[PDB]
A and B are shown apart, each in its own frame.
Chain A
Amino acid sequence: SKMALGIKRASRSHTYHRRGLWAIKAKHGGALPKAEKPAAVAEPKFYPADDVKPRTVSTRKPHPTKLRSTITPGTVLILLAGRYMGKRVVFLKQLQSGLLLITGPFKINGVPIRRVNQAYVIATSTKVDISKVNVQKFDDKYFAREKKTRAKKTEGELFESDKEATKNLPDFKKDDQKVIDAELIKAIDAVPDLKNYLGARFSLRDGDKPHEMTF
């Protein structure tokens, strides 16, 4: 219904409703409000020679990426790129930036609760029942890096010293993975053989055609 949606959105009356010009006929009496003259700073510190153009605070409000039809909270994905390729994970929930949020769990797979792009995953037809996992604590800030300054060039005394020390991933993430993998193993033992499944990794051995291979 892409084009029916196009017309239904495109109606002048429906655009009145959508922009909500009522409740703009509410506040300023029985009429549409005036607008005024901002920008009375009158204090330019320096005058560029080129014709000046201000910063773009972008007013375009892009649509959200559409999560694939074959993705359900609880679906066993297939990672495809990066250090966890072949790893089979379980999809927790497609988070607010658009990226998928998956888990090993780390007790069996070594794949922590981590962010994965939707492009690099192949949803399998199997599901798990996980409506009693409490995932609300995960978001973009949990994962946002605050990547540090490039003044630290990794030298012969940094190489294994970072391995040998622990100034790394924090202990609240340590405890996090414990709570999620507990409440998710309690959901995996239900599905027979699934722990062994997830323990395996998908390998496209000889005589395997992906166009033929279902998932």
Chain B
Amino acid sequence: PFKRFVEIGRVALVNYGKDYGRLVVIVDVVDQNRALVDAPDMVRCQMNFKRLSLTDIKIDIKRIPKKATLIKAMEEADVKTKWENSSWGKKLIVQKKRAALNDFDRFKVMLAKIKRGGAIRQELAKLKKEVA
């Protein structure tokens, strides 16, 4: 068994180019390489499977839907928040936040993480001494 197929409606992360990180719905496949991606801010266009990383979410739509139908299907399947909250998209969100930390916030993160490290170290030593 495979867990993930290129099929109508499946949402895919775009993983290369100037549009890295967008979700796009594969609404139709051109041929064994190219498919149509429909997006809320991006108009339906073909893009190549080499540049798409398939995701875990499927939305249950028709082929080449009307844009309003696709948007309401994105709402009913809740792809934005599910993608954001799952670990894969949280990786991208956290990665862009670490991109957007400046010097002083980076310093406060350093402080908080030194104190976290000390706390974990002390707690681990205590529980390791409780372990016999």
Contacting residues, chain A, for B66 (C-beta < 8 A):
none
Q: Mark A117-154, 1 if CB is under 8 A from B, else 0.
A: 00000001110000000000000000000000000000
B99 within 8 A of A: yes
Q: How close is A202's CB to chain B, nearest CB, in angstroms?
A: 7
- A202: nearest chain-B partner, CB-CB: B103
Q: Interface size (A, Cβ < 8 Å)?
A: 15
Decide if B99 touches A212 in the complex (CB within 8 Å): yes
A36 within 8 A of B: no
Rounded to whole angstroms, the CA-CA distance of A202 and B103 in the bound complex is: 9
Rounded to whole angstroms, the CA-CA distance of A194 and B108 in the bound complex is: 10
Rounded to whole angstroms, the CA-CA distance of A196 and B115 in the bound complex is: 14
Rounded to whole angstroms, the CA-CA distance of A212 and B106 in the bound complex is: 13
A13 within 8 A of B: no
Partner of B103, one of A194, A196, A215: A215
Partner of B101, one of A193, A194, A202, A214: A214
Contacting residues, chain A, for B42 (C-beta < 8 A):
none
Contacting residues, chain A, for B43 (C-beta < 8 A):
none
Q: Interface size (B, Cβ < 8 Å)?
A: 9
Rounded to whole angstroms, the CA-CA distance of A51 and B8 in the bound complex is: 92
- A213: nearest chain-B partner, CB-CB: B103
Partner of B100, one of A76, A124, A193, A214: A214
Can you list 28 residue pairs at the A/B interface with Cβ under 8 Å?
Answer: A76-B104, A78-B103, A124-B102, A124-B103, A124-B104, A125-B102, A125-B103, A125-B104, A126-B102, A126-B103, A126-B104, A193-B107, A193-B108, A193-B111, A194-B104, A196-B111, A197-B104, A197-B107, A200-B107, A202-B103, A212-B99, A213-B103, A214-B100, A214-B101, A214-B102, A214-B103, A215-B102, A215-B103
